[PDB]
């Protein structure tokens, strides 16, 4: 019969930057051993965060360039934000 | 053979706001195409988020009214609160 | 034949701590049932956060101990960081 | 992602009949325990059989009345045909 | 995880030839949709059989030419064996 | 969620014996690799068969001590019966 199923990975990405902040974006290739039979849908999320309060709190994280071998796990601030230590979170479930 | 696997779907939602600032709340209907077979469990969290200092940072997110058939992606700060930009991610897995 | 799936089990825990702060830490056990066939893996994240900006935003989660039979849902905010309301949201696939 | 995968039940029946011979026909319920999610295709064929040569060997068996709760495992010779003994052997998978 | 799992299809293919023969053998073309992802295993029996007792009773099947995207069923007696009626039946799994 | 899936595995036994008779019994172990999860149950039946006239036709056919590891395949006939060749067939599923 016909039903519908996931594989799904997941890790995460410690940076460990204080004393010195974090550098402004970080791409990191991840590796799906064995490949995906189908191209995954992947979501990023936080799961530690060091955030300087002398200016706002801008963070971002994405899954670029995803295939059934993997992707790039990205993360960036911007502008005037300090980011002290953070830890990225991710799945990626076909 | 008696088996427990699951389906899971995911996705993100960005709100781009700056220079204005975010809606208080927002509330976006997900739809699952097709329905899952039982009712799942969604879970949600914000994979990019840029909030002022000048007030304490307090955002809100849920997946509401949750059915086979999808459920309400939900938002919201409170209070003094200002959020400039953010993105919500979500997944759901029966 | 071959073929690789996954059992996800997904879950939150919503800690409202104002008009006290929430404590510095949690561990709160978490069971699986019935018990995974391998040890899945776990990630955990906010789906709500409440933090002063009188100090640096600090907050820390994890899945610590885990096992076919569950795991610690770990949280911890550090040094000044002032934390008023959090909800941690997890997710466990094998 | 979408796949096709099959629950199977299988079973036998076994019908000793000499020193007289078997019934011309038989039709036994079997039930399935849980139900099928969609109907199911069954086979039936012959796991022993014990046939006269004093006439042509005639031997029949299906599955009818199919359904997600069971089917009606059916046996029937005809004609001249004398069987001693026999044993029908059944899988349905959807 | 890794598991393993069969997608099934199955069949039958009734030949009616009384009052005449059936040819000595038989070829039919059996196609599965959608197509297999592996090439499955294919095994063959009878669900139903006429054979003349007036000689020895000699049949025999088979999975040609098999497939993701079907096979040849095939059936054939030999020799001075006369069979009147026959019902072959068959099984795919990967 | 819970679902009822199956691993199946097939195979076949080939006996050409003419111009002898097939012995009166036969045992062969099968192997399952890898091993089954849960025990499986297993089906055996005959894909092709010649047996002599002269005498009531009577074959058997059987799974024994079956495990997750594997099981004897059984076959046999009795009294009178003279079976020239034949082929076993089989399918396992959990
Ligand atoms: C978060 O990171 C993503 C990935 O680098 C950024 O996405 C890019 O956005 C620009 C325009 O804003 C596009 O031209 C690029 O094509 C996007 N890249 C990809 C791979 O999608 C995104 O802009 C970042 N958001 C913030 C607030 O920094
Ligand atoms: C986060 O959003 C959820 C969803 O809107 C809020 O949940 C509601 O909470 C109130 C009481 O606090 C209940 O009466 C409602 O029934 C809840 N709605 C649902 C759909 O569960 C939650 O209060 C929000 N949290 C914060 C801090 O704003
Ligand atoms: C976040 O929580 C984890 C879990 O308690 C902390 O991990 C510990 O880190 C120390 C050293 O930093 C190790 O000696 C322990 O063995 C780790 N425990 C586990 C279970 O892995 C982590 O340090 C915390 N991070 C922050 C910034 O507080
Ligand atoms: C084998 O058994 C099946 C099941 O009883 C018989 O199928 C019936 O065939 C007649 C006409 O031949 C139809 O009118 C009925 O509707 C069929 N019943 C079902 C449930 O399909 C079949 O005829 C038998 N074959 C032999 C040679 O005896
Ligand atoms: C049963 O049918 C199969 C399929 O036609 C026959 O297999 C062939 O056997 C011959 C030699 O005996 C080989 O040269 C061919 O390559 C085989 N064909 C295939 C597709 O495997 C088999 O011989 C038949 N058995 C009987 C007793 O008639
Ligand atoms: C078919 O083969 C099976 C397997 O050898 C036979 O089953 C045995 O039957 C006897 C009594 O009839 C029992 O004492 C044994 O315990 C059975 N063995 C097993 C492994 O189940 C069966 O008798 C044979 N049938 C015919 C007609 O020969
Ligand atoms: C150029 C630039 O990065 N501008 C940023 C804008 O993107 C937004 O983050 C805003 C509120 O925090 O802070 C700055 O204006
Ligand atoms: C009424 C109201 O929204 N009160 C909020 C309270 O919920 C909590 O967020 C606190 C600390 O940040 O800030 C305010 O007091
Ligand atoms: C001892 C201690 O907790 N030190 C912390 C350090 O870990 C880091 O969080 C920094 C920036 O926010 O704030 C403090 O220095
Ligand atoms: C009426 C009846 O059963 N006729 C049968 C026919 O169906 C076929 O089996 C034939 C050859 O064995 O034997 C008889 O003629
Ligand atoms: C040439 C030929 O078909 N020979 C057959 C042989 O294959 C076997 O079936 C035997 C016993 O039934 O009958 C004949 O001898
Ligand atoms: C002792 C013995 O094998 N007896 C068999 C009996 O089991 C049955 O097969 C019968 C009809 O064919 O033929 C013989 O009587
Ligand atoms: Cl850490
Ligand atoms: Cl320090
Ligand atoms: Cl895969
Ligand atoms: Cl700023
Ligand atoms: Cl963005
Ligand atoms: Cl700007
Ligand atoms: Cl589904
Ligand atoms: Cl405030
Ligand atoms: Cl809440
Ligand atoms: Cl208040
Ligand atoms: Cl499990
Ligand atoms: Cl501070
Ligand atoms: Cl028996
Ligand atoms: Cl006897
Ligand atoms: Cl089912
Ligand atoms: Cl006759
Ligand atoms: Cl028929
Ligand atoms: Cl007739
Ligand atoms: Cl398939
Ligand atoms: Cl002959
Ligand atoms: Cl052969
Ligand atoms: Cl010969
Ligand atoms: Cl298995
Ligand atoms: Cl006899
Ligand atoms: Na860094
Ligand atoms: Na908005
Ligand atoms: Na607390
Ligand atoms: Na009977
Ligand atoms: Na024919
Ligand atoms: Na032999």
Redesign the interface.
């Known amino acids: 019969?016909?039903?519908?199923?996931?594989?799904?990975?997941?890790?995460?990405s410690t940076h460990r930057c204080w004393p010195r902040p974090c550098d402004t974006s970080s791409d990191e290739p991840i590796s799906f051993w064995?490949p995906?039979?189908?191209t995954p849908?992947?979501?990023?999320?936080?799961?530690?965060?060091?955030?300087?309060?002398?200016?706002?709190?801008?963070?971002?994280?994405?899954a670029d360039d995803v295939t059934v071998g993997g992707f790039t796990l990205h993360y960036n601030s911007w502008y005037t934000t300090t980011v002290?230590?953070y830890?990225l979170?991710?799945?990626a479930?076909?």
């Open positions: 019969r016909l039903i519908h199923v996931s594989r799904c990975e997941m890790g995460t064995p995906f039979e189908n849908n992947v979501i990023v999320s936080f799961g530690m965060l060091d955030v300087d309060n002398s200016n706002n709190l801008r963070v971002n994280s994405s002290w230590n830890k979170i991710w799945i479930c076909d």
